[PDB]
Write a protein that binds this ligand. Structure first.
Ligand code: ADP
Ligand code: ADP
Ligand code: BGC
Ligand code: BGC
Lengths: 370, 370
């Protein structure tokens, strides 16, 4: 019932997408959107239905050549098919990319993609000047988190891990029910570690960050961090510990050549099945994710930290174990500033139902942009 | 003759302050302002003159009990002694405090002051309801940096240390002549380490930060950091290395008993006279300030970093020495992410002319609240 709460995202073949857009229901203003990641991209169009409902259909391309410029071919092969009837309806064009974006127009460099995303190189049919942008992925995600809060459906998609000291101080509503009137640190651990701060005051503004790339501070783990360092030939950062390659590293350190190396996916799958080794590796992954959160808790003074992404949803098992959850909490407050209770001010929440926040975010940004 | 470019800040005894406010020039809407430090507070009133000129009149109080609640007594004294005709011109009331502030109404805890700053406990005579705010010190400082920029006199108060790679890419104007359309990170190295991020985008918002309280990551200084740690019985943060107490530590470590201990002030004075030990101490302090800078250049993606405060202007001798500057620049770039050029994107600037940024920010903000 609540306005904006119906959010449908359907993935189709390019042909099916094209046929879908010819149906009478899609004779409306179109926003082109693209959630471009390291390995795949979902590109498509979004319209607003009845009851402020959000209707999206996208096609997934593979980022095989690992080159952010590749997507220009995608845009072009899309413009190749679609009828003029459809193309005239495009009112805005917004994409997100997995790297730092400046001026909303130049993205990169990327850790795992070649090149630089350039809005000025994109086809104006999909990217109308004055109504177009490149967002960073977690910037897109933050607009998405905002959109979900505005559609009154926050507790449908996010679960409370633990409510911090400060929420009671400034919120009339229950935690997890709305984004809240306070800063929101949005974290997404996957291939990389994304972070964005939704800042609030006289009201919500999404500010892109790169916390993952900060040098990782040693606590009582000089040896662990020096092992990774000799492997990477670099001073480890947070992402090195909290990413796919991170989880794989933790797993290797646990088994010590007693079992074959597994991918991030395999390790998590093993953990969901109660494998001791994989569970140990997941705890370490999560120990360092709580270190990201403890320091950002100090540095950014957020009201809430919200963990997002398919990996979070899919890892629900890890978070629902009350023992895992107690130890993460303990880790989240393991900072010298906690003596003043800064780490305990913060409420942690985790995405609990699947939803492409990034596309919701491009669409929303696309509204603002026209 | 540029608009807003006259900024006079007169510090007077309270009686002179009272007399001043009686003069025809001060019959005008007033903002009560207060720049409340850990050792003293300048509190008074600001008005706008011809050509958007800014005229502030403040009095100094010593923070004698080291208690933030003590300022309420100062507020009351000020009301007691002020003419009632003056009190009715008060449109807004804004102070800043050396600590994090939530909801613009509750401030602290503080490093060297007891208690908590409560807007609700302040007299409405000086803080009119709905027109009043407690700012963090660098929050205020950030607004003051904006004030200077809008007044077209950025180049009068700030000097370019080095222009980053990104400036010429998005800025027609010379580095140092404008704030710039891009994030500005303000750092105020004093008794503590202040930080605030001036974010930009359709326009400028000031986001308070607590970067100094983050755990200091070890590079090749495990032993140095462990030495500090054993003295503090805390894992060191940035502010432990880059503060008054940090500078004193750096000096003690240089001299190794061969010389009596000196205060931060004594050490910078010795440095200005060319003492070798104090210059070494000052080099180490600025090495850690550069680590603050290289990590936050990554994390916050600023276009510019701006070192502010009396200390900074007063230490100009340190920044003008070309070997020191070159050393600082190399240090600002000593990060693993510089292989992607992130640290070299950033332009560094330092305040080169004395100016109470905090009071200017309290005023700028009090314009928003009235
Ligand atoms: N259950 C899991 N938990 C943690 N990490 C995972 C899991 N499954 C996969 N990963 C890692 O995360 C990556 C996918 O994360 P995702 O956010 O979906 O996409 P990307 O980060 O590539 O845009 C995988 O390539 C793998 O390295
Ligand atoms: N030239 C200097 N360089 C660095 N630090 C200094 C210098 N002179 C004094 N200090 C230290 O800085 C602090 C005062 O700085 P300031 O920012 O003006 O005030 P506060 O931070 O106490 O509000 C004191 O702790 C003092 O010991
Ligand atoms: O994809 C998540 C994150 O991975 C990081 O390595 C990139 O630098 C970020 O910009 C991105 O948000
Ligand atoms: O006074 C400068 C800084 O000192 C720090 O220790 C405080 O926590 C900050 O809020 C403040 O900006």
């Amino acid at each position: 019932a609540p306005a904006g709460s119906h959010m449908n995202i359907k993935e189709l073949s390019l042909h099916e997408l094209c046929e879908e857009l010819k149906t009478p229901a899609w004779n409306a203003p179109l926003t082109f959107v693209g959630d471009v990641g390291g390995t795949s991209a979902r590109m498509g169009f979004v319209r607003e239905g009845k009851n402020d409902s959000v209707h999206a259909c996208v096609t997934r391309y593979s980022m095989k050549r690992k080159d952010i410029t590749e997507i220009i071919e995608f845009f072009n092969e899309i413009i190749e098919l679609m009828p003029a009837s459809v193309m005239k309806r495009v009112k805005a064009g917004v994409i997100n990319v997995p790297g730092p974006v400046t001026g909303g127009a130049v993205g990169g460099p990327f850790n795992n993609l070649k090149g630089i995303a350039r809005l000025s190189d994109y086809p104006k049919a999909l990217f109308p000047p004055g109504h177009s942008a490149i967002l960073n992925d977690l910037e897109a995600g933050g607009f998405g988190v905002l959109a979900v809060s505005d559609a009154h459906v926050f507790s449908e998609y996010f679960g409370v891990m633990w409510e911090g000291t400060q929420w009671r101080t400034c919120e009339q509503e229950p935690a997890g029910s709305v984004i809240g009137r306070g800063r929101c640190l949005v974290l997404a651990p996957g291939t990389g570690l994304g972070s964005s701060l939704i800042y609030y005051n006289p009201q919500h503004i999404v500010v892109p960050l790169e916390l993952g790339s900060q040098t990782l501070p040693m606590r009582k783990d000089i040896d662990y961090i020096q092992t990774l360092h000799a492997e990477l030939k670099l001073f480890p950062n947070y992402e090195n510990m909290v990413s796919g390659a991170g989880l794989e590293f933790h797993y290797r350190q646990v088994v010590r050549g007693s079992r074959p190396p597994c991918s991030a996916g395999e390790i998590a799958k093993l953990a969901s099945e109660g494998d001791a080794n994989a569970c140990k590796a997941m705890k370490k992954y999560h120990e360092y994710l709580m270190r990201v959160g403890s320091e950002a808790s100090m540095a950014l003074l957020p009201l809430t930290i919200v963990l997002v992404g398919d990996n979070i949803v899919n890892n629900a098992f890890f978070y629902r174990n009350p023992q895992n959850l107690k130890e993460m909490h303990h880790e989240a407050l393991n900072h010298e500033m906690e003596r003043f209770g800064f780490q305990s001010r913060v409420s942690y929440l985790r995405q609990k139902k699947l939803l492409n926040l990034n596309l919701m975010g491009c669409y929303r940004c696309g509204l603002d942009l026209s």
